[PDB]
């Protein structure tokens, strides 16, 4: 009977035919939901002279006040002659008009008409209300129509929580050697999982009866299978049912056109519905299709592209029906920066848990995780993941096949088919998985095809635990309400078009337009600065200091925006340089205005100096003042609340507040960017780079002796003349005693990190604490804060990619646990040889002592080292005294996608009374002649690679071959190393080739 009046919008969607609507789909507190249309309006913003001039009157017309339009168009002068900004102001008016309409001199068209939408009829996407049946005509079951959502949607009310449905889904097509085509390949799998507003979870998965002999569909029945003739016969309750390809693909169409809330995939958008949907049109006539919640508009399923360069496309699907088909792929594409976007990779980082061991012995290690193993609910995620796990990655390396499991809702007991090495305590990773999918189809069949249906239907499940992971579902509705966009839109649109609403608003409160009235000269700012630490190898600890959002800072620092831009100056020669210096002090003096000089833009210039207005706030530092103030008011809110669903709440908005202030620079310097403004964006980079500087040259060489902090440079604001007390020796509240000595080491866009003569983590932790302090009460100034974020011990450092360490954190004390810390590297059992790790072990820990020594050059070092090398290395070769287990690596055999490969295990099980079988873990070894002499050549390493089974012996006519452990052993070696030329021609004289560099 009546409709339930308090609704949460949970998405906004548009048909988009010749007669075309706004649509939102809602949900009420008991479950139901309500689709609600509303007319489609193309905005127009215009002056009131425009207003009146207007050939027939707009359709609707509200009045937008007073507002200056100001040009923001960028000019250079060779002098100071600069002739004031133009700026008018006039009453605006906010035009609806439902067809299209070419307006002559029309003003803020960059704005999106969804984006006024919202504004105009003060709506917040993911609002709650209690909607004014008034304003609501019924026209179908379920879907109203609002003539006025203005007033309809008048009352706001709190958010309450809602139930939603999920579909999760992934395919399985068969091949061999091409990548599956839509023509010749059937889908053999369909594997779902379907969450319930209840919260029930069912899985079902549809095997393909057609790649099965009929007495293998027969053993599936007898084995519990259910058997299905037609669509017309499915229960959703079996999770193994087995039927015909156009069975399963009439069963895809019933199910995607369903109108769930969110439909989800890993790449599904590009791969998997994509082949659904050809497959269907080719083995029968149908299309998928989606309708309007009206049954207005309906269309068929066609995925399409969006393009971004700096770069990647994206995948989307065009469903009118308001449901979201979100692939996680392109989001986790857009959201994090890895190394890896492979399912595997992200499973492993995303769930792990800590081990404790219960069994050993056997081929079958055991384990327990709990509270009691690793940190709080970390077992139970992992549990919830292994439901539908089938393969534990243990210790980085040991892909394993589980055998039992228990599972309660904190923690896990796990069986697994592994070797031995029983330590107490190991890691547990749901990450990569030793699957050959190509052999499995080449020789399908019963068992295979349930092997698969249990690795498709945790793919799909994969998409549910990555789901919960990355907190979509709140980051959707927290993006929903700060870009004013709707949900589907949210991490569709790019990071160019999600800033315009939050924009917008701005604009509207400042009663502000910005006008560029040229094309935009072509040049972006980048001139890709990348930073190289001082040394690699470190002795003492490390302290890492971060800026706070150092971008956000600088901009709001120097009031840097387009319309604030005073004007920029150049000069080609010394005497305009200094006579226009001399011209700008006085007539732009701070503290009102700053001059910021610039990498110039034309070859011929010697200088560039942007000067900006500090007295009235720009749009641009406003809009990031804003940004900030969200950000904490949200992080409070995430610490005074205590449900976890709130948390949640708080936290993705928090997040989403993060993002979009940090993507503002890159956004001043894209020329398609409603915040586009060279000036303003060289300038924000150097006033950044400035004040690395500054923060570098007061730290570098500073001392504490005494209670005092000698700083190695006064504490001049670097912009201009400045109150504070410039006097670098600076009291603190250390020990007396403390006599310490402060090096610059490396320092970044963002980050500084200072050595200090020391191994105490406890004493460096105390240190770096007073040192954040004085940073910011006495070196720093305005808005500029560092803060301490840990400290770091054994530090080797390549670049901010490539670096490894003990990270004892600001919390941290001296003896907590450290956090190793790796990154960008690529090694481990079996990359790297025993004698491999043995030796960079021992050079290490000789280069670490030989640093504590003092009494180095990079020379004094680095001769002595190297001679080690040639006499631990030529004794190793002429000697041999070292077993050929220390030189045995690893791999797995496989099929091909690797080639060479084939050929080696082939001829081995060729030749051989065993037989390494295709999913099986062999040893291996660079192995010669002994009549081959030092080589100084290369060719294939590949040809020396011999199998090491348990019968080889090594032939008496036959040596190891050093020279390829040893290359690639000093390669390591003179990456630790900071003189560059002395490695270098050590490397062409021992092994005749040009070594790497991690650059």
């Not at 609707?60 to 133009?86: C, F, Q, V």
């Not at 035009?95 to 960059?110: C, F, G, H």
């Not at 005074?640 to 956004?667: F, P, R």
């Amino acid at each position: 009977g009546a409709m339930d009046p308090d609704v949460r919008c949970i998405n906004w969607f548009e048909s988009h035919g010749e007669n075309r609507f706004l649509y939102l789909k809602s949900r009420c507190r008991n479950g139901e939901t309500v689709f609600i249309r509303f007319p489609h309006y193309f905005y127009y913003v215009v002056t009131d002279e425009i207003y009146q001039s207007l050939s027939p009157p707009p359709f609707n017309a509200r009045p937008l006040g007073k507002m200056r339009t100001i040009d923001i168009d960028e000019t250079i002068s060779y002098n100071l002659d600069i002739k004031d900004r133009k700026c008018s102001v006039a009453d605006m008016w906010l035009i609806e008009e439902p067809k299209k309409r070419s307006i002559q001199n029309a003003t803020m068209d960059e704005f999106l008409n969804i984006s006024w939408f919202y504004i105009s009829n003060g709506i917040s996407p993911d609002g709650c209300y209690s909607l004014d049946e008034q304003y609501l005509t019924k026209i179908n079951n379920g879907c109203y129509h609002c003539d006025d959502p203005r007033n309809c949607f008048a009352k706001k009310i709190p958010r309450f929580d809602i139930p939603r449905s999920y579909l999760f889904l992934d395919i399985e097509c068969h091949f061999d050697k091409k990548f599956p085509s839509v023509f010749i390949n059937p889908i053999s799998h369909t594997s779902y999982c379907y969450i319930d507003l209840s919260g029930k979870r069912l899985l079902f998965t549809l095997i393909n009866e057609e790649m099965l002999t009929e007495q293998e569909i027969q053993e599936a029945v007898d084995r519990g299978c259910l058997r299905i003739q037609s669509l017309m016969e499915m229960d959703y309750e079996r999770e193994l049912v087995l039927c015909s390809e156009i069975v399963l693909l009439r069963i895809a169409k019933q199910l995607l056109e369903l109108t769930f809330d969110y439909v989800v995939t890993f790449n599904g958008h590009n791969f998997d519905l994509r082949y659904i949907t050809n497959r269907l049109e080719l083995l029968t006539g149908e299309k998928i299709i989606f309708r309007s919640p009206d049954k207005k508009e309906a269309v068929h399923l066609c995925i399409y592209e969006r393009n971004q360069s700096s770069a990647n496309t994206t995948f989307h699907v065009n469903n009118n029906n308001g449901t979201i088909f979100f692939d996680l792929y392109s989001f986790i594409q857009k959201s994090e920066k890895l190394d890896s976007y492979k399912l595997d990779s992200i499973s492993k980082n995303a769930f792990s848990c800590m081990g404790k061991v219960l069994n050993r012995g056997v081929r079958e290690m055991t384990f327990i995780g709990d509270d009691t193993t690793d940190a709080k609910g970390k077992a139970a995620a992992f549990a919830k993941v292994l439901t539908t796990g089938n393969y534990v990655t243990v210790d980085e390396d040991i892909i394993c096949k589980v055998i039992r499991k228990d599972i309660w809702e904190n923690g896990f007991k796990v069986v697994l088919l592994c070797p031995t090495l029983p330590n107490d305590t190991y890691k547990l990773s749901f990450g990569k998985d030793d699957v050959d999918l190509a052999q499995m189809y080449k020789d399908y069949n019963l068992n295979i095809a349930l092997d698969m249906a249990r690795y498709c239907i945790h793919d799909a499940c994969l998409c549910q635990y990555l789901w919960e992971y990355y907190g979509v579902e709140t980051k959707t509705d927290a993006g929903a309400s700060t870009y004013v966009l709707p949900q589907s839109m949210v991490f569709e649109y790019r990071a160019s078009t999600v800033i315009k609403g939050p924009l917008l608003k701005l604009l509207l409160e400042t009663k502000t337009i910005l006008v560029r009235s040229e094309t935009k000269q072509k040049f972006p700012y980048e001139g890709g600065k990348v930073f190289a630490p001082k040394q690699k190898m470190f002795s003492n600890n490390v302290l890492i200091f971060d800026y706070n959002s150092l971008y956000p800072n600088v901009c709001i620092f120097g009031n840097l925006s387009p319309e604030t831009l005073v004007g920029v100056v150049v000069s080609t020669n010394r005497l305009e340089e200094e006579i226009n210096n001399q011209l700008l002090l006085q007539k732009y003096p701070p503290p009102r205005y700053i001059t910021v000089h610039c990498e110039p833009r034309l070859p011929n210039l010697i200088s560039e100096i942007a000067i900006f207005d500090r007295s009235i706030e720009g749009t641009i530092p406003r809009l990031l003042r804003t940004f900030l103030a969200e950000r904490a008011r949200y992080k409070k809110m995430l610490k005074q609340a205590t449900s976890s669903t709130e948390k949640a709440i708080y936290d993705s908005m928090q997040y989403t507040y993060k993002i979009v202030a940090n993507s503002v620079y890159g956004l001043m310097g894209f020329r398609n960017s409603a915040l586009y403004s060279y000036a303003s964006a060289k300038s924000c980079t150097s006033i950044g780079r400035r004040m690395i500087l500054y923060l570098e040259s007061v730290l570098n060489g500073a001392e504490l002796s005494n209670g005092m902090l000698r700083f190695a440079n006064p504490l001049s604001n670097p912009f201009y003349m400045d109150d504070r007390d410039i006097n670098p020796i600076v009291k603190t509240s250390l020990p007396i005693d403390y006599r310490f000595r402060f090096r610059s080491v490396y320092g970044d866009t963002d980050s500084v990190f200072t050595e200090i003569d020391s191994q105490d983590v406890d004493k460096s932790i105390e240190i770096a604490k007073e040192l954040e302090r004085l940073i910011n009460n006495r070196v720093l100034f305005n808005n500029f804060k560092i803060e301490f974020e840990a400290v770091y011990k054994n530090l080797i450092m390549q670049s901010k990619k490539k670096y490894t360490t003990m990270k004892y954190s600001a919390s941290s004390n001296s003896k907590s646990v450290p956090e190793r810390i790796n990154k960008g590297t690529s090694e481990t059992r079996r990359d790297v040889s025993k004698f491999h790790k043995n030796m960079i072990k021992t050079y290490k820990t000789r280069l670490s002592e030989m640093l504590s020594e003092g009494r180095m050059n990079s020379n004094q070092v680095c001769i002595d080292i190297l001679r080690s090398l040639e006499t631990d290395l030529r004794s190793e070769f002429d000697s041999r005294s070292s077993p050929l287990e220390l030189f045995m690596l690893s791999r797995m055999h496989h099929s091909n996608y690797d080639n060479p490969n084939m050929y080696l295990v082939t001829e081995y099980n060729k030749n051989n009374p065993e037989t390494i079988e295709l999913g099986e873990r062999y040893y291996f070894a660079y192995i010669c002649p002994a009549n081959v002499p030092w080589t100084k050549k290369l060719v294939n390493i590949k040809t020396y690679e011999t199998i090491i089974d348990r019968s080889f012996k090594l032939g008496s006519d036959q040596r190891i071959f050093y020279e390829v452990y040893f290359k690639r052993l000093t390669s390591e070696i003179v990456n630790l190393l900071d003189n560059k030329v002395l490695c270098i021609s050590f490397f062409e004289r021992m092994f005749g080739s040009k070594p790497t560099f991690y650059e």
